[PDB]
């Protein structure tokens, strides 16, 4: 994301509805999980390192 | 003086008690005919008394849960055959030949990513 875009999302908005989420690692605005605050891409990379506790590849 | 058997079919579990009697079946304190929708289901679950030649010899008290009426009716059949093994282990030969001692291992298949269902693929167009 653009640096101004990341900065603007971190500022307090004039209205509560203007608040939106970005990935806290890379700033991506799309596909951001609430539990981890990571986009789907960063979640995959960090889960591969074993750095997200309890998270592993699922099969059933 | 009763015999117990646990029957499973799909996601249904039946706890089956056999007491001597005239051939009544009660399912969750209801008559089997007021509990199941079809008579073909009733004939399916009375199979163990057929191959064993014990119709009208026991009463069935059933505590069943999970699944639908077909899975429950067939979990009761599995439970009755298992309970009949307790009454007389010599029933095993006739029950096994009829396939009534098998736990039907067929369960709902999981959906797969990319598919519309377990196996159903999306409509394809080479264009």
């Amino acid at each position: 994301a653009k640096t101004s875009m990341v900065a603007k999302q971190q500022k307090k908005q004039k209205y509560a509805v203007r608040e939106y989420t970005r990935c806290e690692r890379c700033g991506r605005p799309h596909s951001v999980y609430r539990k981890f605050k990571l986009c789907r891409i960063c979640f995959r990379e960090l889960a591969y390192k074993g750095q997200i506790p309890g998270v592993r590849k699922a099969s059933w | 003086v009763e015999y117990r058997g646990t029957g499973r079919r799909k996601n249904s579990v039946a706890r089956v008690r056999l007491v001597p009697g005239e051939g009544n079946i009660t399912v969750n304190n209801r008559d089997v005919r007021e509990y199941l929708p079809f008579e073909s289901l009733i004939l399916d679950l009375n199979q163990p008394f057929d191959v064993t030649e014990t119709k009208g010899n026991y009463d069935v008290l059933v505590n069943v849960h999970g699944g639908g009426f077909t899975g429950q009716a067939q979990a009761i059949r599995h439970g009755i055959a298992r309970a009949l093994l307790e009454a007389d282990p010599e029933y095993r030969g006739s029950l096994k030949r009829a396939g009534l001692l098998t736990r039907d291992p067929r369960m709902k298949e999981r959906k797969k990513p990319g598919l519309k269902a377990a196996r159903r693929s999306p409509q394809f167009s080479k264009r």
Binding site: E24, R34, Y48, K49, G50, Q51, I52, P53, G54 | -
Partner: protein, 202 residues
Amino acid sequence: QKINPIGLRVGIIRDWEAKWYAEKDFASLLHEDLKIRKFIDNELKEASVSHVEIERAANRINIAIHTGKPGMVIGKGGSEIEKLRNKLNALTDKKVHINVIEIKKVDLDARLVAENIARQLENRASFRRVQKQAITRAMKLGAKGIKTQVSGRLGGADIARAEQYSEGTVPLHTLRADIDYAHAEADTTYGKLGVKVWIYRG
């Protein structure tokens, strides 16, 4: 095409590097963890750090640092680890306790071998020679197998390619095999070079 060897084995035969539990502060603790891991990577980039483990309990953070050169992390008289612990307590406002664990045989550690190759590539060393030397060293130290790969503009070529070498067995489909894996990047005048190392100890 080929799955990350670590990610496939995480939670199966490989343990998590983050050992803590949370429910509603999960995101806040996860990003304090990532804040710490980025700080340690930058502050100890010359100290041959293989990996960092983080344990949390009772407003305390226990950080284990597995390092090839533990005397640089601790410092002469414990002074370098006291300085790093003081800076971690400022990034965190929690009570951090740091443990240092020496890893003997740095030539059997995928991360250290990968970063050594990346450092040599930045010094214009032969992308073939660095891979072959690393493989010979690991196998002499009893490695069951090793695989190396350098990808990119090798030697400043205009067309990027991948050159890989191997020795021994590296059974990437065997789930119970503990395969050490790492990727590192060399910053050359021609752009990024990717270094991947697979090591199978046994």
